[PDB]
């Protein structure tokens, strides 16, 4: 069950007509675009703080904000209670 | 003369075959059962073709009393129930009676308002008696049709095992009855099957979108109705296509286990899940960094045309000039400060008025032009 | 091999001729793709002949087409591949049934008649 | 003698489309009235609502 390739002239089994045609007409522009995209997303510095840093910052905020957190309520900026 | 005479024969045949159906139902729980199903499904067509004739007869007879009710109530059964309820006395408190079950509230108020100015004479007593006789016969035929549909729905696990899996036995019964048979259902495109059981419901001062058009039994099936309303059209189309495939399989009595039906239902569920799939994570595009380096841009025909379009025009060059000490008069109440400047005013230095530049003429988008062409 | 339910199966030469005629009909805007469009053409009596594939799974989803062809007196044939049939129709997706419509004054009329004669003498 | 000045409160928001259409049939063609009344039955959009 070999069908002649309309794009290369070779013979492929009929189980691989559609995939051979889709791959055969794949623009190298797709390859260069994918390479560019890979370069961009693997080189940009992270903007927001990591998760552990976020947790530590929230812990410091809770320590220094007793009007929201904790049991006892000290002033807005104080940490003793 | 003919419809009335044939009504007795139709009723006798329906009674005999309904006794046969009851005997088959009792026996199930050489006269095979498949022939019984075929006879019942032909009975459905016969009952439909007698009920539409009865509805036409009632519509012709009742048109003397309230001629406008046919347009307000297009459904045959609803028409019959409404003319039975109202009868000769339109203003007889029937509006707040069983009409609320027969009709929607909006169409109830519409029909009441129309009956307020009927301009139709009363019907004779013989015309009455004939009308209630026809209505009772039609209701009995509808009850017999309901019984036949119940019996067929009870036996859908054998005649159409594959199609039962997709939409259930009730919707299967409805589509098989309205199509005229499983064989008739199979010899029918999926687009027509999706519209099976659809009703041209009247829109009473509403958009055609509010009153769901081109929607049939499949659109109101359990699986299709379980999707959000924005995806129910695609759901109806896909389910109708798969039901057509199952019916074509079923009419040849293949995959009696339901393997084709289970595969089609699994495919439908997978497609529904894909439609319900949450959107993927999409990267935020940062603002481009400001740039001061020189950038070389090509010229040519395109650049010339853009320069001609965006370029300053003599009509606009002259409107940007305002005379010094020449206090003009206000020409626009709705926006002060607005002025034509040197356009058509002394001191412009031009005897003749500047012509309109045709390069600045308004034009529509290419896609918009395509849409306008399609609308034609 | 192929499903015996598809008894009017064409050989290699007739398969090539049928695919060529299907492509020419597509170029002439005289072809309908899909089993539903084939059924619509059969019901409207504007179909010269119906070409359907033998790899449809299950094959019963297009076995109603021979019955409609017999009812409407339209020749029908089975081709061995649903992927080549789709390609002949001009669509990358597989097509399991294509209908060649009737267009008066079409230059394909002679080829359509020849293919009809070839098909109608091949079923048995 | 008494001067009464008032408003029809919620005049626009309480207009029934069915009754408005049926009242419009009395002064214009049924096709025009149906167009005008179906025009008020449209989707209202504001950003993501």
Curated annotation (Swiss-Prot), chain A:
In which compartments does the protein localize?
Nucleus; Nucleus speckle
Q: In which tissues is it expressed?
A: Ubiquitously expressed.
Q: Which residues carry this modification: Phosphotyrosine?
A: 48
Which cysteines pair up through disulfides? They are none
Residues bearing PTM Phosphoserine: 5, 43
Q: Where is this cross-link: Glycyl lysine isopeptide (Lys-Gly) (interchain with G-Cter in SUMO2)?
A: 16
Q: What remark about domains does the record contain?
A: SURP motif 2 mediates direct binding to SF3A3.
Q: What does this protein do?
A: Component of the 17S U2 SnRNP complex of the spliceosome, a large ribonucleoprotein complex that removes introns from transcribed pre-mRNAs. The 17S U2 SnRNP complex (1) directly participates in early spliceosome assembly and (2) mediates recognition of the intron branch site during pre-mRNA splicing by promoting the selection of the pre-mRNA branch-site adenosine, the nucleophile for the first step of splicing.
Q: How is the quaternary structure described?
A: Component of the 17S U2 SnRNP complex, a ribonucleoprotein complex that contains small nuclear RNA (snRNA) U2 and a number of specific proteins. Part of the SF3A subcomplex of the 17S U2 SnRNP complex which is composed of three subunits; SF3A3/SAP61, SF3A2/SAP62 and SF3A1/SAP114. SF3A associates with the splicing factor SF3B and a 12S RNA unit to form the mature 17S U2 small nuclear ribonucleoprotein complex (17S U2 snRNP). SF3A1 functions as a scaffold that interacts directly with both SF3A2 and SF3A3. Identified in the spliceosome 'E' complex, a precursor of the spliceosome 'A' complex.
**Name recorded for this polypeptide:** Splicing factor 3A subunit 1
Organism field = Homo sapiens (Human)
What is the primary gene name for this protein?
SF3A1
Swiss-Prot record, chain B:
User: Which stretch carries the motif Nuclear localization signal (NLS)?
Assistant: 295-308
Q: Is Nucleus there in the keyword field?
A: yes
Instruction: Site Interaction with U4atac snRNA: give positions.
Output: 233
Q: Where do the coiled-coil regions begin and end?
A: 30-64, 125-159
MF terms from GO for this chain are: identical protein binding; protein-macromolecule adaptor activity; ribonucleoprotein complex binding; RNA binding; snRNP binding; U4 snRNA binding; U4atac snRNA binding
- Identify one Gene Ontology CC term for this UniProt entry: precatalytic spliceosome
Q: In which tissues is it expressed?
A: Ubiquitously expressed.
Subcellular location field: Nucleus; Nucleus speckle; Nucleus, Cajal body
Entry PTM: Phosphorylated by PRP4K during spliceosome assembly.
Q: Name one GO biological process term.
A: ribonucleoprotein complex localization
- Site annotated as Interaction with U4 snRNA and U4atac snRNA: where? 214, 237, 242
- What keywords sit in the KW lines? Acetylation, Coiled coil, Disease variant, Isopeptide bond, mRNA processing, mRNA splicing, Nucleus, Phosphoprotein, Retinitis pigmentosa, Ribonucleoprotein, RNA-binding, Spliceosome, Ubl conjugation
Which residues carry the post-translational modification Phosphoserine, per the record? Answer: 323, 339, 376
Q: Which residues form the Nop domain?
A: 159-277
Q: Where do the segments described as Disordered lie? A: 278-301
Q: Residue numbers for the site described as Interaction with U4 snRNA?
A: 191
Q: How does it assemble?
A: Identified in the spliceosome B complex. Component of the U4/U6-U5 tri-snRNP complex composed of the U4, U6 and U5 snRNAs and at least PRPF3, PRPF4, PRPF6, PRPF8, PRPF31, SNRNP200, TXNL4A, SNRNP40, DDX23, CD2BP2, PPIH, SNU13, EFTUD2, SART1 and USP39. Interacts with a complex formed by SNU13 and U4 snRNA, but not with SNU13 or U4 snRNA alone. The complex formed by SNU13 and PRPF31 also binds U4atac snRNA, a characteristic component of specific, less abundant spliceosomal complexes. Interacts with PRPF6/U5 snRNP-associated 102 kDa protein.
Q: Which family does it belong to?
A: Belongs to the PRP31 family.
Which protein are we looking at? U4/U6 small nuclear ribonucleoprotein Prp31
The gene designation is PRPF31
From Swiss-Prot, chain C:
The record lists the effect of residue 76 to A as: Reduces U4 snRNA-binding by about 50%
Site positions (Interaction with U4 snRNA and U4atac snRNA): 57, 82
Q: Which GO terms describe its biological process?
A: box C/D snoRNP assembly; maturation of SSU-rRNA; mRNA splicing, via spliceosome; ribosomal small subunit biogenesis; single fertilization
Record-linked Pfam families: Ribosomal_L7Ae (PF01248)
Q: Which GO terms describe its molecular function?
A: ATPase binding; box C/D sno(s)RNA binding; RNA binding; U3 snoRNA binding; U4 snRNA binding; U4atac snRNA binding
What InterPro entries does the database record attribute to this sequence? Answer: eL8/uL1-like (IPR050257), H/ACA_rnp_Nhp2-like (IPR002415), Ribosomal_eL30-like_sf (IPR029064), Ribosomal_eL8-like_CS (IPR004037), Ribosomal_eL8/eL30/eS12/Gad45 (IPR004038), Ribosomal_eL8/Nhp2 (IPR018492)
Q: Which residues carry this modification: N6-acetyllysine?
A: 17
Q: Name one GO cellular component term.
A: box C/D methylation guide snoRNP complex
- Which residues in this protein are found as Phosphoserine? 118
Where in or outside the cell it occurs: the entry states: Nucleus; Nucleus, Nucleolus
Q: Annotated region Interaction with U4 snRNA and U4atac snRNA: where? A: 32-44
Expressed in which tissues: Ubiquitous.
Query: Which key words are in the record?
Result: Acetylation, mRNA processing, mRNA splicing, Nucleus, Phosphoprotein, Ribonucleoprotein, RNA-binding, Spliceosome
Positions of the UniProt region annotated as Important for U4 snRNA-binding: 92-124
The primary site where this protein sits is nucleus
Q: Which domain of life is it from?
A: Eukaryota
Q: How does it assemble?
A: Identified in the spliceosome B complex. Component of the U4/U6-U5 tri-snRNP complex composed of the U4, U6 and U5 snRNAs and at least PRPF3, PRPF4, PRPF6, PRPF8, PRPF31, SNRNP200, TXNL4A, WDR57, SNRNP40, DDX23, CD2BP2, PPIH, NHP2L1, EFTUD2, SART1 and USP39. Interacts with RAD17 and PRPF31. The complex formed by SNU13 and PRPF31 binds U4 snRNA. The complex formed by SNU13 and PRPF31 also binds U4atac snRNA, a characteristic component of specific, less abundant spliceosomal complexes.
- The name this protein goes by in its record: NHP2-like protein 1
UniProtKB/Swiss-Prot annotation, chain D:
User: Localized where?
Assistant: Nucleus; Nucleus speckle
Leader sequence range is none
Found, by tissue, as follows: Widely expressed.
Write down the disease named in this UniProt entry.
Retinitis pigmentosa 13: A retinal dystrophy belonging to the group of pigmentary retinopathies. Retinitis pigmentosa is characterized by retinal pigment deposits visible on fundus examination and primary loss of rod photoreceptor cells followed by secondary loss of cone photoreceptors. Patients typically have night vision blindness and loss of midperipheral visual field. As their condition progresses, they lose their far peripheral visual field and eventually central vision as well.
What's its job? Plays a role in pre-mRNA splicing as core component of precatalytic, catalytic and postcatalytic spliceosomal complexes, both of the predominant U2-type spliceosome and the minor U12-type spliceosome. Functions as a scaffold that mediates the ordered assembly of spliceosomal proteins and snRNAs. Required for the assembly of the U4/U6-U5 tri-snRNP complex, a building block of the spliceosome. Functions as a scaffold that positions spliceosomal U2, U5 and U6 snRNAs at splice sites on pre-mRNA substrates, so that splicing can occur. Interacts with both the 5' and the 3' splice site.
Q: What is this protein called?
A: Pre-mRNA-processing-splicing factor 8
- Per the UniProt entry, what species is this protein from, by scientific name? Homo sapiens
Taxonomy of origin reads: Eukaryota, Metazoa, Chordata, Craniata, Vertebrata
């Amino acid at each position: 069950e070999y069908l002649v390739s309309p794009i290369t002239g070779e013979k492929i089994p009929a189980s691989k007509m559609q995939e051979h045609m889709r791959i055969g007409l794949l623009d190298p522009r797709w390859l260069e675009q994918r390479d560019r995209s890979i370069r961009e997303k693997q080189s940009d510095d992270e903007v927001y703080a990591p998760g552990l840093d976020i947790e530590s910052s929230l812990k410091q905020l809770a320590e220094r904000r007793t009007d929201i957190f904790g049991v006892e309520e000290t002033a807005i900026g104080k940490k003793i209670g | 003369a003919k419809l009335w005479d044939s009504k007795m024969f139709a009723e006798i045949m329906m009674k005999i075959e309904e006794y046969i159906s009851k005997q088959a139902k009792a026996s199930e729980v050489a006269a095979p059962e498949y022939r019984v199903i075929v006879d019942a499904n032909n009975l459905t067509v016969e009952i439909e073709n007698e009920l539409n004739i009865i509805h036409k007869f009632i519509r012709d007879k009742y048109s003397k009393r309230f001629p406008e009710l046919e347009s307000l109530v297009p459904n045959a059964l609803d028409y019959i129930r409404t003319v039975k309820e109202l009868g000769n006395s339109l203003d007889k408190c029937k509006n707040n009676e069983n009409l609320q079950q027969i009709l929607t509230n909006a169409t109830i108020m519409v029909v009441s308002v129309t009956a307020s100015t009927t301009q139709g004479q009363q019907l004779s007593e013989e015309e009455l008696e004939r009308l209630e006789e026809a209505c009772d016969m039609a209701l009995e035929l509808n009850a017999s049709k309901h019984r036949i549909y119940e019996y067929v729905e009870s036996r859908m696990s054998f005649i159409a095992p594959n199609l039962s899996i997709i939409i259930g036995a009730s919707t299967a019964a409805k589509i098989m009855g309205v199509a005229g048979g499983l064989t008739n259902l199979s010899k029918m495109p999926a687009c027509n099957i999706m519209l099976l059981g659809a009703q041209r419901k009247t829109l009473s001062g509403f958009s055609s979108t509010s009153v769901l058009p081109h929607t049939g039994y499949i659109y109101h099936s359990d699986i299709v109705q379980s999707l959000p309303p924005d995806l129910r059209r695609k759901a109806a189309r896909l389910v109708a296509a798969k039901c057509t495939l199952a019916a074509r399989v079923d009419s040849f009595h293949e995959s009696t286990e339901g393997k084709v039906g289970y595969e089609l239902k699994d495919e439908i569920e997978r497609k529904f899940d894909k439609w319900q799939e949450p959107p993927p994570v999409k990267q935020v595009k940062p603002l481009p960094a400001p740039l001061d380096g020189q950038r070389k841009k090509r010229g040519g025909r395109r650049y010339r045309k853009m320069k001609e379009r965006l370029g300053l025009t003599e009509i606009r060059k002259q409107a940007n000039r305002m005379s010094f000490g020449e206090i003009e008069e206000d020409a626009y109440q709705e926006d002060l400060g607005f002025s034509l400047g040197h356009l058509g005013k002394s001191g412009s230095g031009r005897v003749r008025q500047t012509q309109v530049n045709e390069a600045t003429k308004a034009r529509i988008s290419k896609t918009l032009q395509r849409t306008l062409q399609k609308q034609s | 091999d192929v499903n015996p339910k598809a008894y009017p199966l064409a050989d290699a030469h007739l398969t090539k001729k049928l695919l060529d005629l299907v492509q020419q009909s597509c170029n002439y805007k005289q072809l309908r793709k899909g089993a539903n469009e084939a059924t619509k053409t059969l019901n409207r009596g504007i179909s010269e002949f119906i070409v359907m594939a033998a790899d449809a799974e299950p094959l019963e989803i297009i076995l109603h087409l021979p019955l409609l062809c017999e009812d409407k007196n339209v020749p029908y044939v089975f081709v061995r591949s649903k992927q080549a049939l789709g390609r002949a129709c001009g669509v990358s997706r597989p097509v399991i049934a294509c209908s060649v419509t009737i267009k008066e004054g079409s230059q394909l009329k002679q080829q359509i008649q020849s293919i009809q004669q070839s098909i109608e003498r091949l079923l048995v | 003698n008494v001067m009464l000045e008032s408003r029809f409160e919620k005049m626009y928001e309480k207009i029934d489309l069915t009754l408005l259409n049926r009242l419009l049939r009395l002064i214009v063609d049924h096709n025009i009235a149906d167009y005008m009344t179906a025009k008020n039955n449209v989707v209202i959009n504001y950003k993501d609502m």
